[PDB]
Each structure stands twice: as C-alpha cells, then as structure tokens.
C-alpha cells in the first residue's frame, strides 16, 4: 500500500529488510512467491466449482434435521467439512471453521449460522441455478480451502493450531482480534512448528505446560538440553532490556513472542560463544546516537 515515490529513508530501509527476510524465508522453505500469495490472498474467486458443489451437497444432506439447542452447530458441521475438503482430522476442520468465523470471509461477511441458513432455505441440490448470495457462499468455501492450505503448509500440530485459533494472545497476536494468515504470521507459525519439532519427545509435555500458565525456565531447559541458569539469565537480560512488546516475568514463558525473544538471545549468545551478559555488554555500545550517553 505504501508508495516508493514518497517514502522516508528509514522506511525504505525497513522495507528492504522486510523484503530480504521474506525472500530468505521463502528460499529456506522451497516456496514460490505465488504459493505465498495464494496462502495470504484475501480476494476470492466467485465461481462455482464441482468440489464446492460436492461440499454443499454433503453439508446439506448431513445437516438436514439439525437442532440448534441439542448440539453446537459448528461441531456437527465439522465432520462433513473435513470429508469434503480433504482433511485428515475432524478437529482440524473444527478449528478452521472457528478461524473462518472469526475472519468473516468475503465481501458479504459469511459465518456458519448464515451459511447453514442459506443452505437450508435457498439451496436446491442437484440443479444449476443462479443465486444472488451464491458468490458469497463460493467465497466462504474458498476461504475454508485456503485455511486448509495454511494448516497443511505450516506443519503445526493439531492441538497447537487449535490453541492458535482459540487464543491468539497466547501466540502474541494483538489482543481481541482474529488471527491473521498474513505472511508475517505464517513465518512465526512456521518457526513455532520448527521449535516444537526440535523439542522432540519432550514436546508432548512442553506444549501441555505451555497451554497452562505452567511452563518455566527449568522445564524448558531440560526439554532443549540447555543449562537452566543459561535460560534464566537470558530471560533476565531480556526483561532488563526494552523490547517491543515488553517482556515481564508473568509472560516471559507465557507468550510465544517472549519465548521467541529469549531463544533469539540464546542463539546469539551461543553464536558468539559467550554468555548472555556478553550480548548485554555488546548492545550497550550504542556509540552512534544522541539518545543516551
């Protein structure tokens, strides 16, 4: 959206850094630019497809006779969505549906209740007819399929994907907003999945302690086969220095942004083969500025 013709030098440098980082990430991920654009796309083609038609037929047949008070609509609709959209697990479809309901895809904001009502009233299976709302239905189905492409490309585990959909604050997304499938969120999801894979067999306990407000320096140090004092002092150094967002003892292992910051400190310290106090001494050498002595 920002124009290159009228831009500040520091803003241009930030844009250069963002482009370089994303290009490097794509090269590491063996991903084409078109795939990233498809995964991050918002505009959806409003054209009926046989796959979408089969999805509509299956959902309409399965959900016929559904009672609202007897059970949750989303849970009942999840198995048919999983069957139609080629998903391995049912709860993955349930999480995808929750994420879509939070996003409200398309030009006409679409949700499970609206989709079910449209299918119940204005849909006649087995016939090709033109409906004014049909394009919004197609857009919602395309968004669901794209969020499948997201889930499968990221490689995250099913329960951490459920946690990300239900509580974006745990992943440090802006509070009170639906999670973004922006590439900026995609890269952090990929990093979370890679860290979980690196934890190996310990990941099962680490994730459970993370989903509660339970995780601590010592347990995570045992999980990563690192020194507990090393993680404790890295966390202390991160707390001492001004990050954005700020890191405080009650989120230092509760928010993923804080765990990522601590791990970046640990990685940089071990790259330099020095303690985190070494990096703390290094970053004090801001000698080309007027902000501080």
């Amino acid at each position: 959206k920002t124009n290159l013709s009228a831009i500040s030098d520091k803003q241009l440098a930030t844009l250069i850094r963002k482009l370089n980082t994303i290009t490097s990430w794509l090269h590491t991920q063996k991903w084409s630019v078109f795939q990233l654009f498809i995964m991050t796309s918002t505009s959806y083609n409003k054209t009926l497809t046989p796959e979408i038609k089969n999805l509509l037929d299956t959902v309409y047949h399965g959900l016929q006779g559904f009672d609202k008070d007897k059970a949750d609509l989303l849970h009942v609709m999840a198995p048919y969505i999983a069957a139609t959209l080629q998903l391995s697990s049912e709860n993955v479809a349930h999480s995808v549906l929750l994420w879509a309901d939070k996003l409200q895809p398309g030009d006409g904001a679409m949700t499970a209740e609206k989709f079910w009502d449209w299918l119940n009233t204005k849909y006649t299976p087995g016939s090709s007819e033109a409906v004014e709302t049909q394009e919004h239905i197609v857009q919602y189905c395309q968004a669901l399929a794209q969020l499948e492409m997201v889930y499968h490309s990221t490689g995250i585990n099913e329960n951490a994907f459920r946690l990300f959909v239900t509580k974006p604050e745990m992943f440090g997304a802006a509070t009170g907003a639906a999670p973004a499938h922006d590439a900026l969120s995609l890269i952090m999801l990929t990093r979370f999945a890679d860290w979980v894979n690196a934890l190996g067999e310990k990941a099962s306990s680490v994730l459970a302690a993370f989903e509660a407000n339970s995780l601590t320096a010592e347990q995570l140090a045992d999980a990563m086969n690192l020194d507990a004092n090393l993680l404790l002092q890295a966390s202390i150094q991160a707390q001492n220095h001004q990050h954005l967002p700020p890191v405080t003892p009650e989120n230092a292992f509760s928010c993923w942004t804080s765990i990522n910051t601590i791990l970046q400190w640990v990685n940089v310290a071990q790259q330099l083969n020095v303690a985190p106090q070494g990096v703390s001494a290094l970053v004090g050498l801001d000698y080309i500025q007027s902000m501080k002595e």
Binding site: N54, D57, Y60, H61, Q64, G65, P125
Partner: protein, 146 residues
C-alpha cells in the same frame, strides 16, 4: 418408504417422515447408500417404540334398530321391521335421510341390492368416556351379527 407408511398408520404421525432423499449420490458410485437407510430405519424404530404405549382395548355393541329408531325427529324415525319388509316387496323406495338413510343401490349392478347406511357421528361413541382418558379413538375390528 413402505415401512414409513406402516409407521404413519400404526401411529397417527402423518407429518413424521424419516427417509431422506440424500441416501444415493452418483458422484461416489452410490457407495455406503445402504448404511444411511440402516440409520434411518434405526431412528424410525427408536421413535416408534419411544412413542408407542399400551392402549385401552374397549368394545361397544351398536343396535342398528335402536340407532334408526332413536333418530332425531328432524329426520323421519323408523324401526327396520316396517321398511325392510316393504322396500323388498316394492323393491324400491327409501326411508330415513342423510347418512342414516336406508335405500337401494345407485349403480346398475346394485339396483337390486339394498344397503342400510349409518353415520359414526350419530353413534356418538366419543361421549361414552371422559375426554382426558384419551384424545384419539380408533376402530380395531368391526364384527356384524344378523
């Protein structure tokens, strides 16, 4: 759908339909179509035994010579003794009125046949018990004696 008619007539729930059109799909060669009907039949049997209860079996004699002899005088009251034995001797004519009339057949083969009609509305059988005993009253078996 024949078992569904049997359900909708053993019970009175003419509105209740359990078999859905979605059982067959040509996209997937119609696979698993029978298991959807098997679930539909299971739902039909479960609702059937869920709703069924023991009904009070009752019997009532109707005397037709009394139902015609007691006919409200806005129709001509008659005992069957004096019209059977003249609408045979004349082979023709009528007695009574409305759905309680006694008369010969209308159709060409029935012109010899003599039929006696009575309305269940005049049997008034629904009065014979309190209403709160049960709202629906249905015939089990009509037996005739001559």
């Amino acid at each position: 759908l024949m078992a569904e008619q049997a359900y909708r007539w053993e019970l009175n729930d003419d509105s209740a339909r359990f078999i859905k059109p979605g059982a067959w799909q040509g996209t997937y060669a119609g696979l698993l179509a029978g298991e959807t009907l098997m679930l539909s039949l299971a739902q039909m049997e479960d609702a059937h035994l869920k709703r069924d209860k023991r009904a009070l079996e009752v019997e009532r004699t109707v005397s037709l010579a009394e139902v015609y002899a007691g006919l409200p005088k806005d129709n001509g009251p008659f005992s069957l003794a004096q019209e059977i034995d003249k609408l045979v001797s004349q082979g023709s004519g009528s007695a009574g009125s409305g759905n309680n009339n006694l008369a010969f057949g209308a159709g060409t083969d029935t012109k010899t046949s003599l039929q006696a009609s009575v309305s269940f509305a005049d049997l008034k059988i629904r009065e014979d018990y309190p209403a709160s005993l049960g709202k629906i009253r249905r015939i089990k078996q009509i037996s005739v004696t001559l």
